[PDB]
Amino acid sequence: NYPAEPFRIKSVETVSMIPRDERLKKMQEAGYNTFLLNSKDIYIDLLTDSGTNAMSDKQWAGMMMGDEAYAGSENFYHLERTVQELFGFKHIVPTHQGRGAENLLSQLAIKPGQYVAGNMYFTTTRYHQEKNGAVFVDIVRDEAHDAGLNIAFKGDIDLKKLQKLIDEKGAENIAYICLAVTVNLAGGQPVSMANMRAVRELTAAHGIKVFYDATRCVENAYFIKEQEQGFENKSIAEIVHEMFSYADGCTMSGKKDCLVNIGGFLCMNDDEMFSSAKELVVVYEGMPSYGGLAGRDMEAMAIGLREAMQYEYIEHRVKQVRYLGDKLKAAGVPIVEPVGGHAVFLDARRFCEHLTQDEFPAQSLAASIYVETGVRSMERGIISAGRNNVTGEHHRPKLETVRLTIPRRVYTYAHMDVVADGIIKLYQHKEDIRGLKFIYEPKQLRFFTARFDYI
Amino acid sequence: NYPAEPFRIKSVETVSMIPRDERLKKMQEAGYNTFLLNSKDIYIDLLTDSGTNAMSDKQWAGMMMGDEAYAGSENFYHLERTVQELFGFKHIVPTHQGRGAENLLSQLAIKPGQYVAGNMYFTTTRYHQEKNGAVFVDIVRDEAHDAGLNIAFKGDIDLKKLQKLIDEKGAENIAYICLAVTVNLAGGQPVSMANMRAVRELTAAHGIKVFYDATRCVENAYFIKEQEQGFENKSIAEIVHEMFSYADGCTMSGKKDCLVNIGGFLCMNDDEMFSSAKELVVVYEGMPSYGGLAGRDMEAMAIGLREAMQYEYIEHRVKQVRYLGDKLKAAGVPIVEPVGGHAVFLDARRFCEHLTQDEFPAQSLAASIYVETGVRSMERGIISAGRNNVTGEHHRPKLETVRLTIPRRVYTYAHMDVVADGIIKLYQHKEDIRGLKFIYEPKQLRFFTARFDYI
Amino acid sequence: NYPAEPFRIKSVETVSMIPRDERLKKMQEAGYNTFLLNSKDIYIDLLTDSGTNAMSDKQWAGMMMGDEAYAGSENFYHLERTVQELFGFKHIVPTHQGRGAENLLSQLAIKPGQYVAGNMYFTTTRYHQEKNGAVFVDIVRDEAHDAGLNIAFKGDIDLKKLQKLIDEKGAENIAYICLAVTVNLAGGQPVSMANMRAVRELTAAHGIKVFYDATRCVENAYFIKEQEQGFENKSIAEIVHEMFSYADGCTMSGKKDCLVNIGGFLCMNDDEMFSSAKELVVVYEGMPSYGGLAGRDMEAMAIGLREAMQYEYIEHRVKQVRYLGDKLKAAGVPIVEPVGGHAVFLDARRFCEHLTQDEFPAQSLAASIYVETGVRSMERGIISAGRNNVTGEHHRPKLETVRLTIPRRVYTYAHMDVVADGIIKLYQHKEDIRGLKFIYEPKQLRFFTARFDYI
Amino acid sequence: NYPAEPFRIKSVETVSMIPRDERLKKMQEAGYNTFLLNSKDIYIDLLTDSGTNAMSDKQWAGMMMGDEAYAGSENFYHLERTVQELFGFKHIVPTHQGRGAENLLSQLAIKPGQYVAGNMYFTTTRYHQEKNGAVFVDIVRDEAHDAGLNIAFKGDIDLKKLQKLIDEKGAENIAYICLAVTVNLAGGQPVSMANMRAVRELTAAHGIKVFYDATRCVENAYFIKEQEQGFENKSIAEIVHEMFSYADGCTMSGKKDCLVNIGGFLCMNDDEMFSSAKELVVVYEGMPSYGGLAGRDMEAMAIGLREAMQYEYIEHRVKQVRYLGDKLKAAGVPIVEPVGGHAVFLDARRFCEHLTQDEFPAQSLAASIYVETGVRSMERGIISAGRNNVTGEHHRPKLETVRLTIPRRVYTYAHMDVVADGIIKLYQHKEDIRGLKFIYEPKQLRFFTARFDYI
Ligand SMILES: O=C(O)CCc1ccc(O)cc1
Ligand SMILES: O=C(O)CCc1ccc(O)cc1
Ligand SMILES: [Cs+]
Ligand SMILES: [Cs+]
Ligand SMILES: [Cs+]
Ligand SMILES: [Cs+]
């Protein structure tokens, strides 16, 4: 049911291993805000699955072969090639990370007042659309928004909302379709291949462009392989290449499924767009030949993209998350379902039924997980949603979650046990989890630096 | 006169060593544009001094100590504390490179229609200023536009122009003063400490903010020590700290004087502006704790900044460039003078008086240098100025130069000899340099991919 | 019971993951000798615990700081000072590995015809002793030769035998006492602190020198802490230091408990012997300042020794082996007991009672394990004992075992499960294990290259 | 005349750069013995050309791909292959360094009382022959012993002394011919290919075996290419492979021409010898599959051996030494001639004509070179030759030299200038160099730790 690691450990990253009593002082010193803890004081850092991947020995042999020419670097050539071969986009511009590609895609493909429609959104992506004049429309299935509904391919687009958007608004005024795989906001839910093929035939008919937010495309490809009829004899690399055939381009963040600690890229097939991309790339990132990346990082991303296609790697990655989700669900701990490709989201509202959302249950639960286990998790509730500065009132988000985001090839099943066991013991005396009040609240970006105290 | 390397070679980058006949083929495949040459086919790459520095064995040991947490990394802490110590600014936000810092500073510091005044500009910096509504005003002394005039501290601001701008336009309508150390357009020329003090006193009086474009600020420090009376007992580290004491903040590309291959940072002292910066940095670069850089890169840049302060390193850096210029001057080759900190600029109109500027003398020279020595240099003339799209006619630039830009710690004095020697023998037969016609010209960013043939 | 890894995965070694049918081909190409298998074709290599440790990110940062001077290296100084501190010996001469230390100690400490007495032997150590004229005398307690007897501190010396040797042969005719921690032939069994004190007092009385074979001395430390009354408040670092206080010097293979891939060292307190050692080390290993090791390796071994002292590391190391043994014991698989610090030994005569020891049961089992799981283990039986060349007949060894040796910090608990699970299902059909005949047998070192077929 | 480096610097090793006054305290603290100085306090360490080579970026990418299996490692396979392909020996056993191979060759190929004859000797090699019963006979040309005679191929064997040795002693009692390339003792002098072909036909006729001491075989191959008629159209790899065709095997030290910091090997074509080598390899070095080397070191040696065949690399290496020799000879500084492949030997007896050999001129000159330049050199005179412990009298060596041994790819021509210039300034006031007296003299290995004072 749960595979052993399809790799050996080559090098370890040592941890201090501080006791509960010292962890509580550390948590207090951070103001009960896990964003303020130091990296050194944390055993298992599940804050994000972004850029904290463990690289292979081959990736580190790439790291010493960094040809750092400004232009003409063999690292750029090898990255271009790999992405062309694997994803099949004609052109490819390297960027420092996913949000660097996003910035470029939104400046090049949006006319003010056009609509951008996708399957739910991701913060940096919506920002760049919106800052360029687009109106974002969510055309995800309604079922994606029910956080307990256990259905498959929950990130698919409603073709029926897709159609009415074109009828009602006009294909002309639709900038592009932003299809994301997986759907982060629904908890890392996969998009079926049928869904992607349907979306491309509808949009093609009406002349509409489709651009993929492909940050976790390889976790998506595993779901298709695991769960869609017809892909049982297909390889992950075949599924990934078919996926990108229903798209005109994509913004990718290597920090997610590329198994690197930095790097992203923009791909497109349009030669015209590509020439415009090239001029805009030099102001924001660096020349078209390196895009704000050191050569050794283009190489390591190249080797990573290829390493991610190994079935055994992506199966264990995804099933290592599911392991954690299964163990929590088995004990009755409330989570978002079905468990996604990269994280387990605890539902803090249900976990902490005694607390109201003003007493910051997700934030407080996330503080407690650190003290009990030495595991850092991230608040994804009311604190992260911010205050409405018109009214002054918090924005009250429907989802009041603590996210357990798993970096790739860093932790073992024993580390998941540590996590699961602490959360289970906490669930068993859930009523004893206190509420938090701010003792310090920033104007902007409050989740980052807010500090709190117990009520 | 000319110091020996104050280091030893730890590891080499192997090179091909292809012969003249093979290089001529390579330059032909490239369409005689040196920007299209492959990095593998080049022996000594002087395209740029950006990001191609050789790191130390301690930087590389820091490379293996990357703490890649999203937040709380030991490498962000070591970076932050190193800049605060060395440069003296209160806050520091890391960015993937210099232009990411510039984007951020210009969104935070300019109201549309205000004036931003500096000592000559750099492309990216001027773009970010103007893109945010600023009108750019060049207040460098008149003597820095004279490419042949050999005076010291050619980068200094004319205070007389700085006064008239305040008079004429008013200090409320001045966004900030953009002081660059050193000045790249004038050939990498230094700014005196007196000049920096003078500017801080005049702008202070009028409430005007002063932000440095500090990318080559340690090369500048060296000229201050070598040439300004009074700084003969001060250390490079004291010179740097004093310099930044006259600025409100700075944008910095670590790729230039921090001796790394990627990385930059915005600094400022204003708390209010720092908070605005943190919300904006998330969208463009990454969380404010990493700013688009892997942990290992924050580490290496921290260790780099600190190595850059060693007298003997910087003294050998600047004197190695000087050596190349000295050898060229002594054979009668025309160069920008006086020699800067980072590059030698050949004067290609002089070098090639038989050719008109429509016959693309600098590009042709840069093609000929590669063919004869295996060295790549950058065209900096009519080809890189671009055409006027309303007229259609070339922007015919006053300076028609070939830039020999020297990466820190990569080449030896024998390498300077290969360059010098080839450039001297071409000078001896300068009349045999043919002109070039376009055989393919791109709508935008023409210098990057234009290809040519001989007339 | 079973601790989680007290570290995180920094970098992985990618593995093939070939299927059963392909492994069977591979095992056949190997002639069913697991020593001929390729390292690429192996998933989990338990051939040996020697030199295949995963290093830390600090060891690797030390790897980039190799000062490779012939003499005066900072890495020799950091090594020397770390051993002096941790182990407490006055002098320390680095050697390329444990047996280089042994060669040196035996040339310096034995007069031909003297007796050298220890607690069971190890091949290399016994070779170097005997090659220098020594007669080897086993003074381990009688209970350690009983492979099934589960007592603690099975490595302890019988003082009664140590007394008779002194009586019978005289202390002048005793070269030195060779005390091994832990005892590899008995299955990696520990030596109590009491036993080490007892020996030091008896040998001291008689003027007899005591040199440790300390290769797994930190695994031993752990058993002392876990099991000897009185050492419950002492640290691994205090246990180690106290242990070496009962020895005159030690030969050490860093490949085993210093967590490195190469390196060893001889220690002693005698100045006279140190001077003789320095002249002899030059001929066999290198100058006394490097002893056959690159500077980077002296560095990593210094950093390794110091990491080996962390309670949680060593406690997880020893408990990971125990875990594997526990799972095997619980299904009724016969193993040497009690489980050692570094390996589990299967009892293959038991496991395979249908086969005679001429039918090569251990080798056959080791072939079958690889086929069924992808794990390599070592034959330790009749095949590795060799033949008698006067008789021609096999040396028929009392112990007929398959050793599952676990490298430090490389595999997880899921990896232990793969092994355990395969070994348990073979045990369930133990009668189907065929015997092997030689199809090629070498004159010497037969186990290394012998090949077989099935009967 | 002197080529530029055929490489770029990838990483630097920082140096402290301490002034003459502090260097003199450092020299005093070392007892005027350069063997006692620390590596950190030295600018340019010319103590030895052994193991202090700078590796390439490809070699360091090998360093991260170390497959550390005990047996079956892909690194072992790649080393075996490279050596088989390049040198052409049938079998090859890895050893920790050159003296590990020597130890094995001498145990396997000498019967007590047999003669070993070679072209002069090297310490560790003669030791291992002599310790195994051989009588060494020097059959080098007489001209090699005249240290000022500038002739080519000074390391050739006298075929006429070769013949009389067989006549007078009997081919039967000649163990093997030890042919070394280059000849270290004559100052790194080359052996012609004709000489090697002649030696093989003579020895073959009488059934006598020939084993190469090939530590600097690649510097030898350059001389043949530079100076022997007929090899102008041959490549270095062709010259090296022909060289080894006149040999039955060889001991190699990778630390010399293999461009690594550790590693050696033994090669032979005899299958019988090879089986005996295998059993003896496990006691002294480690299994036949790794020979006392970590996997990453076998890989790096593999890539190094191949990198050394680049003509441009070996030409610049050798001509970088010659540069130093030419500059010293031009000023009249007395050296051994002709300058060898790896070092310049100063003749301290002539340099210091005012001092008698009891006042230790070479030692004192070597102390002065450090104080004036920060360059460490090695005494190779009376101090290194030792005392005769029968008489108690120093052994008075004919050659009283200070050796300037150049590591490969570490220093530039500017570093050689630093060296040359300091030695020239010292020569100009040569009479002011004082004599030394011991204040501390070790029984064994005196050169290593003797300390002195000025008379
Ligand atoms: O960990 C992640 O979610 C990716 C990075 C990320 C974190 C926070 C935020 O507001 C936007 C992006
Ligand atoms: O630097 C060298 O000469 C190689 C090593 C070496 C040094 C000294 C010695 O006595 C024997 C060998
Ligand atoms: Cs990261
Ligand atoms: Cs770069
Ligand atoms: Cs090893
Ligand atoms: Cs070395």
GROMACS .gro file of N, CA and C in nm, chain C residues 38-40 45 48 50-51 60 63-64 67-72 74 77 96-97 99 103 127-128 131 255 261-262 275-276 279 282-288 290 292 294 296-297 376 444 448, chain D residues 35 38-40 45 47-48 51 55 60 63-64 67-72 74 77 96-97 99 103 127-128 131 255 261-262 279-280 282-286 288 290 292 296-297 376 444 447-448:
model
  276
  948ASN      N    1   2.671  -0.599  -0.953
  948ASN     CA    2   2.708  -0.459  -0.967
  948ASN      C    3   2.632  -0.374  -0.865
  949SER      N    4   2.700  -0.267  -0.822
  949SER     CA    5   2.639  -0.174  -0.729
  949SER      C    6   2.523  -0.101  -0.791
  950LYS      N    7   2.520  -0.083  -0.923
  950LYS     CA    8   2.407  -0.018  -0.990
  950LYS      C    9   2.282  -0.103  -0.985
  955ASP      N   10   2.205  -0.204  -0.037
  955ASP     CA   11   2.328  -0.281  -0.024
  955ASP      C   12   2.365  -0.299   0.123
  958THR      N   13   2.812  -0.456   0.359
  958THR     CA   14   2.906  -0.417   0.463
  958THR      C   15   2.859  -0.287   0.526
  960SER      N   16   3.098  -0.083   0.610
  960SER     CA   17   3.222  -0.011   0.601
  960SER      C   18   3.225   0.087   0.485
  961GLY      N   19   3.238   0.215   0.518
  961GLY     CA   20   3.274   0.322   0.428
  961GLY      C   21   3.161   0.371   0.341
  970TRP      N   22   3.025   1.757   0.417
  970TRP     CA   23   3.040   1.799   0.279
  970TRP      C   24   3.091   1.941   0.267
  973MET      N   25   3.442   1.901   0.306
  973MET     CA   26   3.493   1.845   0.183
  973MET      C   27   3.544   1.949   0.084
  974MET      N   28   3.490   2.069   0.086
  974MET     CA   29   3.523   2.181  -0.003
  974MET      C   30   3.630   2.273   0.055
  977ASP      N   31   4.252   2.143   0.270
  977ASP     CA   32   4.382   2.211   0.256
  977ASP      C   33   4.478   2.097   0.229
  978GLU      N   34   4.526   2.090   0.104
  978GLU     CA   35   4.597   1.971   0.058
  978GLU      C   36   4.747   1.983   0.068
  979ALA      N   37   4.799   2.077   0.148
  979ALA     CA   38   4.945   2.078   0.169
  979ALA      C   39   4.988   1.939   0.217
  980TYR      N   40   5.112   1.904   0.181
  980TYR     CA   41   5.177   1.783   0.223
  980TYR      C   42   5.194   1.779   0.374
  981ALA      N   43   5.220   1.896   0.431
  981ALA     CA   44   5.248   1.911   0.573
  981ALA      C   45   5.183   2.039   0.620
  982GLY      N   46   5.125   2.045   0.739
  982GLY     CA   47   5.081   2.169   0.799
  982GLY      C   48   4.935   2.200   0.770
  984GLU      N   49   4.551   2.251   0.774
  984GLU     CA   50   4.449   2.278   0.873
  984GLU      C   51   4.360   2.157   0.902
  987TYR      N   52   4.533   1.925   1.150
  987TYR     CA   53   4.526   1.987   1.282
  987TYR      C   54   4.388   1.973   1.346
 1006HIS      N   55   4.520   0.561   0.589
 1006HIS     CA   56   4.413   0.558   0.490
 1006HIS      C   57   4.292   0.479   0.535
 1007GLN      N   58   4.306   0.377   0.619
 1007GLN     CA   59   4.193   0.309   0.681
 1007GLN      C   60   4.242   0.224   0.798
 1009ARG      N   61   4.311  -0.100   0.854
 1009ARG     CA   62   4.422  -0.194   0.840
 1009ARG      C   63   4.557  -0.127   0.820
 1013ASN      N   64   4.875  -0.260   1.043
 1013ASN     CA   65   5.010  -0.287   0.994
 1013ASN      C   66   5.116  -0.216   1.079
 1037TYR      N   67   4.586  -1.104   1.080
 1037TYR     CA   68   4.693  -1.110   0.981
 1037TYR      C   69   4.811  -1.026   1.030
 1038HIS      N   70   4.792  -0.899   1.059
 1038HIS     CA   71   4.906  -0.812   1.090
 1038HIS      C   72   4.985  -0.856   1.211
 1041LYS      N   73   5.167  -1.208   1.088
 1041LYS     CA   74   5.272  -1.166   0.996
 1041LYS      C   75   5.390  -1.109   1.073
 1165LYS      N   76   3.588   0.459   0.857
 1165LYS     CA   77   3.491   0.403   0.767
 1165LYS      C   78   3.372   0.343   0.842
 1171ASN      N   79   3.370   0.779   0.440
 1171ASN     CA   80   3.382   0.680   0.334
 1171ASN      C   81   3.526   0.635   0.321
 1172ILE      N   82   3.619   0.692   0.397
 1172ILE     CA   83   3.759   0.647   0.391
 1172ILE      C   84   3.832   0.713   0.507
 1185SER      N   85   5.754   0.810   1.767
 1185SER     CA   86   5.868   0.839   1.681
 1185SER      C   87   5.898   0.725   1.585
 1186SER      N   88   5.895   0.602   1.633
 1186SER     CA   89   5.912   0.487   1.545
 1186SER      C   90   5.799   0.482   1.443
 1189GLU      N   91   5.849   0.722   1.139
 1189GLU     CA   92   5.939   0.678   1.032
 1189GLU      C   93   5.871   0.569   0.950
 1192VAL      N   94   5.564   0.676   0.680
 1192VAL     CA   95   5.606   0.733   0.553
 1192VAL      C   96   5.610   0.630   0.442
 1193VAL      N   97   5.659   0.511   0.473
 1193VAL     CA   98   5.678   0.407   0.374
 1193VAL      C   99   5.548   0.342   0.331
 1194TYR      N  100   5.461   0.315   0.427
 1194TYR     CA  101   5.336   0.247   0.398
 1194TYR      C  102   5.224   0.343   0.361
 1195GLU      N  103   5.206   0.458   0.426
 1195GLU     CA  104   5.084   0.536   0.404
 1195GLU      C  105   5.106   0.675   0.345
 1196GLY      N  106   5.199   0.747   0.404
 1196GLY     CA  107   5.239   0.880   0.357
 1196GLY      C  108   5.304   0.954   0.473
 1197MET      N  109   5.340   1.079   0.452
 1197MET     CA  110   5.396   1.163   0.559
 1197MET      C  111   5.303   1.151   0.678
 1198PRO      N  112   5.355   1.172   0.798
 1198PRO     CA  113   5.279   1.157   0.921
 1198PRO      C  114   5.176   1.267   0.936
 1200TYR      N  115   4.953   1.347   0.697
 1200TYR     CA  116   4.835   1.324   0.613
 1200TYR      C  117   4.798   1.176   0.615
 1202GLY      N  118   4.818   0.915   0.408
 1202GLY     CA  119   4.747   0.849   0.300
 1202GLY      C  120   4.609   0.907   0.278
 1204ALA      N  121   4.365   1.245   0.164
 1204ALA     CA  122   4.356   1.385   0.119
 1204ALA      C  123   4.311   1.468   0.239
 1206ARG      N  124   4.080   1.698   0.264
 1206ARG     CA  125   3.934   1.696   0.279
 1206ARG      C  126   3.883   1.575   0.357
 1207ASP      N  127   3.954   1.462   0.356
 1207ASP     CA  128   3.910   1.342   0.422
 1207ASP      C  129   3.945   1.341   0.569
 1286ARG      N  130   2.149  -0.681  -0.122
 1286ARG     CA  131   2.270  -0.763  -0.125
 1286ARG      C  132   2.309  -0.792   0.020
 1354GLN      N  133   4.294  -1.861  -0.436
 1354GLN     CA  134   4.279  -1.782  -0.315
 1354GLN      C  135   4.177  -1.670  -0.326
 1358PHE      N  136   3.532  -1.380  -0.296
 1358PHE     CA  137   3.531  -1.264  -0.382
 1358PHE      C  138   3.489  -1.296  -0.524
 1400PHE      N  139   5.937   2.246   0.687
 1400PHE     CA  140   5.844   2.136   0.707
 1400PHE      C  141   5.752   2.163   0.825
 1403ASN      N  142   5.294   2.616   0.902
 1403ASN     CA  143   5.156   2.578   0.871
 1403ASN      C  144   5.118   2.613   0.727
 1404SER      N  145   5.023   2.537   0.676
 1404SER     CA  146   4.971   2.561   0.542
 1404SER      C  147   4.904   2.696   0.530
 1405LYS      N  148   4.826   2.735   0.631
 1405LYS     CA  149   4.759   2.864   0.632
 1405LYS      C  150   4.856   2.980   0.623
 1410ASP      N  151   5.285   2.731  -0.199
 1410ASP     CA  152   5.346   2.614  -0.134
 1410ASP      C  153   5.406   2.524  -0.240
 1412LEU      N  154   5.638   2.294  -0.174
 1412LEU     CA  155   5.702   2.189  -0.097
 1412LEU      C  156   5.705   2.059  -0.177
 1413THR      N  157   5.594   2.038  -0.249
 1413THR     CA  158   5.580   1.917  -0.328
 1413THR      C  159   5.479   1.940  -0.440
 1416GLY      N  160   4.987   1.549  -0.480
 1416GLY     CA  161   4.855   1.556  -0.422
 1416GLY      C  162   4.796   1.693  -0.397
 1420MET      N  163   4.173   2.032  -0.903
 1420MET     CA  164   4.089   1.949  -0.988
 1420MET      C  165   4.002   2.033  -1.081
 1425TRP      N  166   3.521   1.743  -1.000
 1425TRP     CA  167   3.434   1.770  -0.885
 1425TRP      C  168   3.291   1.726  -0.910
 1428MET      N  169   3.313   1.392  -0.804
 1428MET     CA  170   3.321   1.381  -0.659
 1428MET      C  171   3.185   1.362  -0.597
 1429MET      N  172   3.076   1.412  -0.655
 1429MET     CA  173   2.944   1.393  -0.600
 1429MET      C  174   2.875   1.267  -0.649
 1432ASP      N  175   2.996   0.626  -0.584
 1432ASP     CA  176   2.917   0.507  -0.553
 1432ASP      C  177   3.009   0.435  -0.456
 1433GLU      N  178   2.968   0.428  -0.330
 1433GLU     CA  179   3.058   0.378  -0.228
 1433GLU      C  180   3.033   0.232  -0.193
 1434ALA      N  181   2.984   0.152  -0.287
 1434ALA     CA  182   2.973   0.008  -0.259
 1434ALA      C  183   3.112  -0.047  -0.230
 1435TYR      N  184   3.124  -0.151  -0.147
 1435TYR     CA  185   3.251  -0.215  -0.116
 1435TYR      C  186   3.309  -0.287  -0.237
 1436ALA      N  187   3.220  -0.331  -0.322
 1436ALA     CA  188   3.248  -0.413  -0.439
 1436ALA      C  189   3.141  -0.375  -0.541
 1437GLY      N  190   3.179  -0.355  -0.666
 1437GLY     CA  191   3.087  -0.341  -0.777
 1437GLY      C  192   3.061  -0.195  -0.811
 1439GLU      N  193   3.051   0.156  -0.966
 1439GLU     CA  194   3.071   0.216  -1.096
 1439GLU      C  195   3.196   0.300  -1.103
 1442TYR      N  196   3.478   0.063  -1.188
 1442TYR     CA  197   3.465   0.020  -1.327
 1442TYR      C  198   3.518   0.123  -1.424
 1461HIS      N  199   4.582   0.318  -0.227
 1461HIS     CA  200   4.562   0.452  -0.174
 1461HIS      C  201   4.660   0.552  -0.234
 1462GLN      N  202   4.786   0.516  -0.256
 1462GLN     CA  203   4.876   0.603  -0.330
 1462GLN      C  204   4.985   0.518  -0.394
 1464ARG      N  205   5.298   0.456  -0.303
 1464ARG     CA  206   5.370   0.363  -0.215
 1464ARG      C  207   5.289   0.241  -0.176
 1468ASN      N  208   5.471  -0.139  -0.238
 1468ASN     CA  209   5.465  -0.245  -0.139
 1468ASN      C  210   5.417  -0.376  -0.198
 1492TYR      N  211   6.317   0.146  -0.079
 1492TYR     CA  212   6.274   0.086   0.046
 1492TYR      C  213   6.201  -0.046   0.023
 1493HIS      N  214   6.093  -0.044  -0.055
 1493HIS     CA  215   6.014  -0.165  -0.071
 1493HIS      C  216   6.091  -0.274  -0.142
 1496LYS      N  217   6.358  -0.382   0.145
 1496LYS     CA  218   6.291  -0.454   0.252
 1496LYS      C  219   6.246  -0.593   0.209
 1620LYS      N  220   4.844   1.104  -0.742
 1620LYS     CA  221   4.881   1.231  -0.682
 1620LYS      C  222   4.979   1.305  -0.771
 1626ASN      N  223   4.416   1.447  -0.559
 1626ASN     CA  224   4.479   1.474  -0.430
 1626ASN      C  225   4.508   1.345  -0.354
 1627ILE      N  226   4.480   1.229  -0.413
 1627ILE     CA  227   4.504   1.100  -0.351
 1627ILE      C  228   4.472   0.989  -0.450
 1644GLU      N  229   4.509  -1.116  -0.326
 1644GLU     CA  230   4.508  -1.159  -0.185
 1644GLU      C  231   4.587  -1.061  -0.100
 1645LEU      N  232   4.702  -1.014  -0.145
 1645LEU     CA  233   4.785  -0.921  -0.070
 1645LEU      C  234   4.724  -0.782  -0.062
 1647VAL      N  235   4.404  -0.707  -0.001
 1647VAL     CA  236   4.311  -0.694   0.109
 1647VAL      C  237   4.375  -0.672   0.245
 1648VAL      N  238   4.497  -0.718   0.273
 1648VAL     CA  239   4.556  -0.690   0.404
 1648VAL      C  240   4.608  -0.547   0.414
 1649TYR      N  241   4.668  -0.495   0.306
 1649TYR     CA  242   4.735  -0.366   0.317
 1649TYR      C  243   4.646  -0.249   0.277
 1650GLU      N  244   4.552  -0.262   0.184
 1650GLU     CA  245   4.482  -0.145   0.132
 1650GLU      C  246   4.330  -0.151   0.143
 1651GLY      N  247   4.272  -0.264   0.104
 1651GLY     CA  248   4.128  -0.287   0.104
 1651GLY      C  249   4.094  -0.379  -0.012
 1653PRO      N  250   4.014  -0.563  -0.366
 1653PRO     CA  251   4.054  -0.540  -0.503
 1653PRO      C  252   3.964  -0.440  -0.575
 1655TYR      N  253   3.834  -0.163  -0.446
 1655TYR     CA  254   3.841  -0.022  -0.406
 1655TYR      C  255   3.980   0.013  -0.357
 1657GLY      N  256   4.154   0.081  -0.088
 1657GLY     CA  257   4.187   0.185   0.008
 1657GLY      C  258   4.149   0.324  -0.039
 1661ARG      N  259   3.447   0.801  -0.502
 1661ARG     CA  260   3.459   0.932  -0.565
 1661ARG      C  261   3.602   0.967  -0.602
 1662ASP      N  262   3.697   0.910  -0.528
 1662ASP     CA  263   3.839   0.922  -0.560
 1662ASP      C  264   3.877   0.834  -0.676
 1741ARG      N  265   5.704   2.842   0.028
 1741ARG     CA  266   5.766   2.729   0.096
 1741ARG      C  267   5.837   2.639  -0.005
 1809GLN      N  268   6.500   0.974   1.424
 1809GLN     CA  269   6.445   0.930   1.297
 1809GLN      C  270   6.379   1.046   1.223
 1812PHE      N  271   6.445   1.560   0.898
 1812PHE     CA  272   6.405   1.673   0.815
 1812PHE      C  273   6.267   1.724   0.853
 1813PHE      N  274   6.175   1.632   0.878
 1813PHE     CA  275   6.041   1.663   0.922
 1813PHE      C  276   6.031   1.756   1.041
   0.00000   0.00000   0.00000
